[PDB]
Each structure stands twice: as structure tokens, then as C-alpha cells.
């Protein structure tokens, strides 16, 4: 099967760094430079062996044909109203990018408003962020090229879809918020830096500033409204209150769900927005999250995790601001996580809870917090919503493992609420009724019960014979909830597979305590939970080690890489997408400094001692047992991934190939693929999505010798 040679890769044996008395060698440190001829050559030499391996088997073509057919169904976002018009995104099925449409009423003819497909030949220019003026008459929108986090903001007049001259450069991790006077918009930008700013560069991102752009002016005239030059990692995002009176500034430092909250009453500005605003530092620490919901005069309703790991709603009066005086509007639930909250039709709140990793959607009274209405849902996720304070209706979008999902609509002006299906799409070719989704709770190493979803064909014998695809993330307070994936259902239907998703610690599935259970000194809990998930699938007879594939991306790419080093005997195949592999250096690059809230930072001795134990780059080791080799591994990354710089995967693959790939007992392939004109994955065009899943499943089919099932 290894009908190919690994490329020779130079080792810089002089690259030795002292970490708190521990010497670490980093012989592929030179791969950190994306622009060098050396690094370019390495990448070319790697893709040269990977592409033929993946494309040799007819199963890739069979999978791609099926994916192309089954993925070709219409995809809609919720309707949402702005000013006097409705908007929605729509993809006929296989367009590279979804298209923004406008209609003058709910039954009016729709027309194309913004079509990102015409911005490139290959669909690699995508929308990233947008903001309508309060009256709905002007529209600002971010564009990213090649999947980079860098954005250019452009502007349109809505009536006639007219392009405006205004262009904002150097935008990244940015808010977009228009003042209600329609004069201009808040956004964030970064100071000029040496070298490139296109998504191929690794330079750290510091000193983000908040600016106000006056419409019809050049960007050079933009007003600096907030900056934190003594705190280079702080990021201040602006939003206007629902009545337009206040700018709220949420300042973050890292990825924890906490923020400072300052405000500025715009009516108190001496002469409009002319420089740094008269900020009032209502919450001036990083001890809690304060997420604006709505206000009524000086009474501000926020969703918070302050003293409430499962979140709750509080009212803070700006004119009586001490914490002792805050009113608890909707108290914390004992187990259910309050995921998000919206205010609609003046005095309703829409609350979305997570209960054992399934959503429930509720309407509450703003004045008392009282429950009014439960919106009926099947078991799965709410993935989209519209309805702001001035609106008199909501839309919401539901999805699940087996259903592409449904957009619902509810007219909130009605005395008796009657939600109805507004849009529904069926994917013929996959009969949902042939399959089932079960949820189980398995005990981890320390006895903690972890949820896991399993999706499989009804009636199968649990005799260990099925290939399985087990997915995890485990970090950053992100909950991994049910969603429709045609590519995974093809694995079930046409490869006879079992799908599994493990809700391991580090996630937000059981609130901030679940998140803290998988970070910092307890990061090893994530890996233990995930390994235990694999043992459960095997023990209960869903699969066997040699038929089990694991998959994760980003922080989940770290998950599956670590699990390969720690338990190579447990897995047949590992696909790590855009993974954080160098845990000693991740903080040095682009936005990596933000992840130290989950991981820690190697500059501290204490953190170093945690990180060195699991950092995938630093834990590649030939298994001691003669009959154990590493699983088949595929790393996927891309040259404009400026979220997780691709050097992580480059250094990791060189290391795997040299330490393990050179040993006589290793017969499983250890491969990387580096895509071009693509990034971390946000805004990836449909054509690339299809190619990527075809690569992934062809790898699986080949490594496990799975027969296609027509
Ligand atoms: C990956 O897991 C998910 O994309 C990477 C690697 C570890 C964590 N991330 C990651 O992207 C984190 C987690 C989700 C958001 N995030 C960011 O880095 N976001 C950029 C950002 C924006 C504002 C403030 C801080 C960070």
C-alpha cells in the first residue's frame, strides 16, 4: 500500500530551546515561514504523494458523485426584516456561495441583492459579517478572500442595490454597528504591520482599535473611539442599544466567555462622535460575561454567567449600578444551559435552552421573566433565528442528524400563537426512517458521565463489524449539537458506517463547569473522555479498533492527534483538520494568543508542565509493543488558514513521518494535504467542501478496505 516514499525533510538539529530547564528540540522550526522556497517545496512534495493515494481508488469518485447528488438540495437561511424589506440567504443547491435575496413583502417577488459568486471564478471570496443601518436603507458587508480572517468592508445603498465608494481595509475580528442616526458605523481594525496581510502570514494580531466610519468619507478620516495600548490583547466590540441611545463596548481578552462592559450615552457627547468617547466603565473586570439583550430606559437586561455557570438573565440599572441592586429576571436553571436570548416585539424574550444537548425554544415576558409559550420542536438544534425588538414576528431554523431541517415562522401580533412551517426541504436518496439516533451516557475514567450521540441503520447487530466515524471537539465552551451532514450520512448509507459524536468536557453542553472540566490543568480530561467514547463503541459492539475512524477540527484536530499519540492501539484511522499541533508555540501566531484561556501558555512553568505532556508535536513516539503501529493518519490544512497557521500541521507531519514513518513496523500511511486558496473553513465554497469530504472518505475507504454499497 505504501507504494511511495516520504520526502526527505531537513532537520535543524541546532534548534534547541530551554523551557524552564527542559530542553526542547524543534528541528522543523523552518516550516514556520510560509514564504520560503524550502517550505513551498515541502508542501509540494507532500501533496505529490497524498493526492495520488487518495485518488487511486474508484471509491473517491463514487463518493464524490453521491455527495454532489445528495448535497444538491436548496438551502435557506431564516427570513429577516430590515426597514421595509425582507432578506434571506438562499443556495439553489450547489452554488459555491449562498446568495442574499430581497423582497418588498413576504409574498413579493424576490430578487438577488448580493451574489458573492460573481466576485471570484472559484467561489473563494465569501461574505464575512454584515450590518444593515437601523432604518434598513444602507448595508455594510465584509468580504474575505481565500478563507482568511482578514476582511474588507464594502457598502451598498439598499434601494436599487447601489454600490457605494466606501471601502474599509485592515478589518479582522470586527464588530459592525451603525449609529441610529444613519451617519456611520463602528468597526475594528489593526495597525499596519510589516510583510503580508492576506492570510498566509503568521504575524501576531495585537492593538486592535475601535473606529467609527462616517459614510461618504475616506477611511483615513475615521474616528478613533477606543484603544487599549497598555493591554495589546484587549479587543473592544461596539453595539448600539435597541433605542439607539447607548454604544455598549464589550472588551474581551482571550476566548473565555467573560467581558468588560463599558457604555457611552451618545446624547452626552459634547458634539457627536469626534474622538475617544466618554466611556462609563460599568463592569471593569473580566470576572463575568454580560451579553446585551435589551434595555428599557436605563434598565439593561443582560445574559450573564456571573455566579451562574448555566447562565441567567439579570437587569442592571445604569442609575443604580451596584451588583447588590441587580434584579434576577430569569434565574439560572439547575442543569439546562441558557444558550442565547433575543428581545422581540417590544416586550417578549425568546430563550433558547440546551437540555441534554438538545434545544428547547421558549417565549418569555420581558417585564417579569415569566414563561409564556414553548415552541414545539423535534429533538435537535436551533441553528438560526430572526426577530429583533421592533419586529413583530420570528423565524427560527431547526436541524437534526437525520433532517436537513425546517424554518418556522410565528406571527407575534396574534393573541394565540400559531407557529407554522415556512420552508422545508427533503433530501431524496436518504430515507430518515431507515436510521436512528440514540443518546447514551458513558462513564469516563474519573466516573463522570459523558453524553454521546450514535446514528446508525436500524436493525444492525452489535457484533463489532461496522466501520465507525467518531467526532469530538472538546473546548472553548462550544457545544456539539445535532446537525444535518449529508457527507456523514453517505458514510452510514454507502459505506455501512456508524456515526458517533462524543460531548466531551471542554465543551459548553453542561455550562461553564463542563468548559472548565476540559481546560488548563484539566485538558487531559478531554482526551480521556474521547478515548473512553471509543472504548464504549468497541465494548458495546458498534465497531472494533481497526475499523474505527476518529475526526476533529481545530481544537478537535488537537483532540484526535493527541489521541493518536496516547492510544494508537484504539484507532484504525485519524483525520485531523486544521489542528493545533504545536502547544508550545501556538500563542506566537496570528490570533493564537487568544487560546491561552483554554490551554495556558508555555511562558509559565506550571502551564508548560501541563502542555508538554500532550502537545502532539512533542509526543510522537513509536509504540513499545511490537504488534502496535500508529493508525493511518491524514492531516488537512490550507495555505490561507490564518486562524490556525498551517505550520502546526507541517511540523507535525514531518515529525510523524520521520519518527514513526521510517520504522519498519509502520505500514499505515501518515499523510498531509495542503489546499490552495482556502483557510480555516469558514466561507469555503461548495466545490471545495465536496472535494474535501471526498478526500476524507476515500482515505477511510482505502485504509480500512471498505466496499462501497450502491
Ligand atoms: C479552532 O478550535 C476553532 O476554529 C481554533 C483553535 C483553538 C480555538 N480556535 C478558535 O478558532 C477559537 C475558538 C472559537 C473562536 N476562536 C477564535 O480564535 N476566535 C477569534 C477571536 C475573536 C475574538 C476574540 C478572540 C478570538
UniProtKB/Swiss-Prot annotation:
It catalyses: Hydrolysis of Pro-|-Xaa >> Ala-|-Xaa in oligopeptides. The N-terminus is blocked. GO terms for biological process: proteolysis. One of its GO terms (molecular function) is serine-type endopeptidase activity. Ubiquitous. GO terms for cellular component: cytoplasm. Gene3D superfamilies: alpha/beta hydrolase (3.40.50.1820), Prolyl oligopeptidase, N-terminal domain (2.130.10.120). It comes from the Eukaryota. Its EC number is 3.4.21.26. It is found in: Cytoplasm. Transmembrane segments: none annotated. PANTHER family: PROLYL ENDOPEPTIDASE. Cleaves peptide bonds on the C-terminal side of prolyl residues within peptides that are up to approximately 30 amino acids long. Belongs to the peptidase S9A family. This is Prolyl endopeptidase. The lineage of its organism: Eukaryota, Metazoa, Chordata, Craniata, Vertebrata.
